[PDB]
Amino acid sequence: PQITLWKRPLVSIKVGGQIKEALLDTGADDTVLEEINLPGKWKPKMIGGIGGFIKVRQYDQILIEICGKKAIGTVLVGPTPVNIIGRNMLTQLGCTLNF
Amino acid sequence: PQITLWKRPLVSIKVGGQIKEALLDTGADDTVLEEINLPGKWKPKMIGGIGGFIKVRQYDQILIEICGKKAIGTVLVGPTPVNIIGRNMLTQLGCTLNF
Known part of the structure; x- marks a missing residue:
């Protein structure tokens, strides 16, 4: 797809047997989703930096699908105001x- | 240009007689630059929301140029960790x- 930036680029995503809604965010380095039950071992990671840090759960080589196209990447799970598809996953798509 | 998202999409921008460096951020609704001396009347605006608000200066119909292409949009000036080109200006380009 070619996405126009008149509206927030909010897309439907398939990750971990759930269908969630997430933002295509080139400003974000990493991919952070609200609580979800992903496979595997996870490592604890600090993200944020500005105003304070937020402890998330880093899971590796997780598959998400967006508008027909599949991606394998690191996904961090923790309390996030909106689900972010950042560049690690943008490059994969x-x-x-x-x- | 076609921009790849392996690196942070940091580009050189021409705004208000200055050349600054700013991030192409689809996750951002608005365009916020660090202190710069722009023409016109400005209105005071609240941005942020999450963790607190940041008071910026909203200037209208300001021209920025990026990689050869010119845009006219609202630009908000205040203390920002990195200069954001958000969607108001992304759509213009x-x-x-x-x-």
Whole structure:
């Protein structure tokens, strides 16, 4: 798809047997989703930095699908105001910004 | 240009007689730059919301240029960790996400 930036790029995502809604965010380095029950071992990671840190759960090589296209990447699970698909996963979807 | 999301999409921008460096951020609704001396009347605006608000200066119909292409949009000036080109300005550059 070609996504226009008139609206927030909120897309439907398939991750871990759930269908959630998440934002395509080029400003974000990493991918953070609200609580979800993913497979595997997870490591504890600090994200944030600005205003304080937020402890999340880093899971590796997790598959999410977006608008038909599948991606394998690191996904961090913790309390997040909105679900972020950041660049680790944007690059996996073959995603570019274009103008 | 077609921008890849392996690195942070940090680009050079021409705004208000300055050349600054700013992030192409689809996750951001608005455009916020660090202190700069822009023309015009500005209105005071609250942004943030999460963790607290940050008082910025909303200037209208400001021209920024990025990688050859010119845009006219609202730009808010205040203390920001990194300069954000959010969607108000991304849409002006004819910018899409693509995969």
